[PDB]
Amino acid sequence: QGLKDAYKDYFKIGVAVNNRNVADPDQIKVVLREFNSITAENAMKPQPTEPKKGEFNWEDADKIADFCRANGIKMRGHTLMWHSQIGSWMYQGNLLSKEEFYANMKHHIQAIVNRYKDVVYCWDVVNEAVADSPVYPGRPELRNSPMYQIAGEEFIYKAFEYAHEADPDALLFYNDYNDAEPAKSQRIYNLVKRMKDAGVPIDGIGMQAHYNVYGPTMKEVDDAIKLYSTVVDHIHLTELDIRINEVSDWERTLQQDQYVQLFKVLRKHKDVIDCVTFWNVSDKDSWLGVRNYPLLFDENYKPKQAYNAVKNFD
Template sequence: MAHLNILKKSALLMLSFSLLTACKNESGKAEQPALTTEEQEQEKGLKDYYSDYFSMGVAVAPNTIKGESAELLLKEFNSITPENVMKMGPIHPEKDRFNWEEADAIAEFARENDLMMRGHALVWHQQHGGWIFDAEDGGKVNKEELLSRMKTHIDSVVGRYKGTIYAWDVVNEAIADDSTQFLRKSEWYDITGEDFIIKAFEYAHAADPDAKLYYNDYNAIIPEKRDRIYKLLKMLVDRDVPIDGVGIQGHWSIYGPSEEELREALDMYSSLGLEVQITELDVSLYPWEKEQRERRPGDVDEFTSELEQKQLETYDMFFRVFRDYKDVLTSVTFWNLSDQYSWLDYYPVEGRKNYPLLFGEDMQRKKAYFQVIDFAEEKE
């Protein structure tokens, strides 16, 4: 009997050794036990659920690429867009001076973590640094000088991030809000007419021939502005201007746009042979307002269960449509990471709390998140 017990113990030891050996990797270190299905689901992020559809991005500030925010970003997203630091005013505040530090840090973060990166935005009527329009004599520069300064800016910025930034918002918001006008009455337009748009794309293409070049605008789904954006895009395409796509700023709300409006716009833009990206997605709890204003009676900032449900349904509709258009839609980028911070907390009403994103103030997934990924179970 003692002999049998020794044999049994030996067999158990051999079995344990075999199992331990099987669980070691090539470096000789014991591997971690296989994850359960539930644990595997916890490890997946938006980028994984949508890997067969389009890239999933987020707008970042310098503090987003640090600490807990960076961990959430890397788990959920595979693309980033600098929210402000690459706009002309912040990155090029004076004619002969550039601020590269914060933009460089974000670009380095993208390279280190193998993230796609969009550039935002080369030419815009806001945050431009007033110097670009000012002549040395105190007046306004002429057309030739303005285009020359714009070229220098584009050459410098696009050239610096060549190979890191795969796509640029070249011209931002050039269409007028006033339906009686076509192009926005900005200093760009006043000095150059429509030429600043055409030249911006030409300069950007020359600076980085491999980068995708986009025109970017808001209210691009609303029919009356959609039609004028389409007119501009068609003009650029017909003139063989080097443009690759249109960026639709998805600053939407639980009140709209409708599914019909969204599908019609995607059909129109893609009919030009252009790629489409949703560049600045958030879903506000309040109706659209363009102008900054003060708080009024009735301006509440509570995220009620009714608003939560409505936002969930709205996100669900948007992403159902996005999935249907995966052949023309190449990226969806959220404008900010979580409800801890959103530009909508400050605009159009300063201090009115909004909850427009898929991650809450605690940086945890909201109910709308699970609705957005619910299709994955159906697919499997």
């Protein structure tokens, strides 16, 4: 009886996984106990699935979908478009045409969405498209990636349209980090507003939630959720973790209260938040290394004092 069961009347609890998390008994016992949603940490990203034009690799992603199919869990599909882990070929030495690009993007999205539409319930369609903060008013709100350089903001719209065609029943999200920062969260809102007003097919906003001990206050996070709440009916925390920096009893206490504060805020917003997904299973497999003591499971795949606090609430 784990996390998922505790938050059953609030929202799903999920976890990004790697090949070994769904292949090793000791880790599998944990994942099934605690979570009712799964994200591929890497296996559905654009370079991992299409490292050359038209040459799809489904090996790693299939294992993970397999695991979900079998245990009656639905997946989040992480991501269809992103300026990282992407094959240069999609957008180029020279940049390609809007049209040659849209085709590479349409071909890719449509394949992958169709392939896993039976397990994926939602898709992080575009990732990290909004620009980092300091944006001096009037200057471009979006990150100047190659895709933007070719399409401008239009490529995001196409990506959401292309994925909607391939599966009309999936919830399609825009996903980003520094989601609770005022300026950036305002920019995110602006983007999604534009899409809503144009009638582009977006459903939800993905809050990465790469937080830390000193980074955002609970006010900031509760604010951004209200702001986002007024443009979309679906919010996921998508890659949650709380790094201690930027091994003491004190730091451990600090991280504990944040996690406890954070889940108080999200419980209040149960009705718009459908999912809270931790970025890795345990500190062992955290992308931030174990130095950062970032998750509710320690390097032995065992719960920390913080685990019981978050779980035994009310």
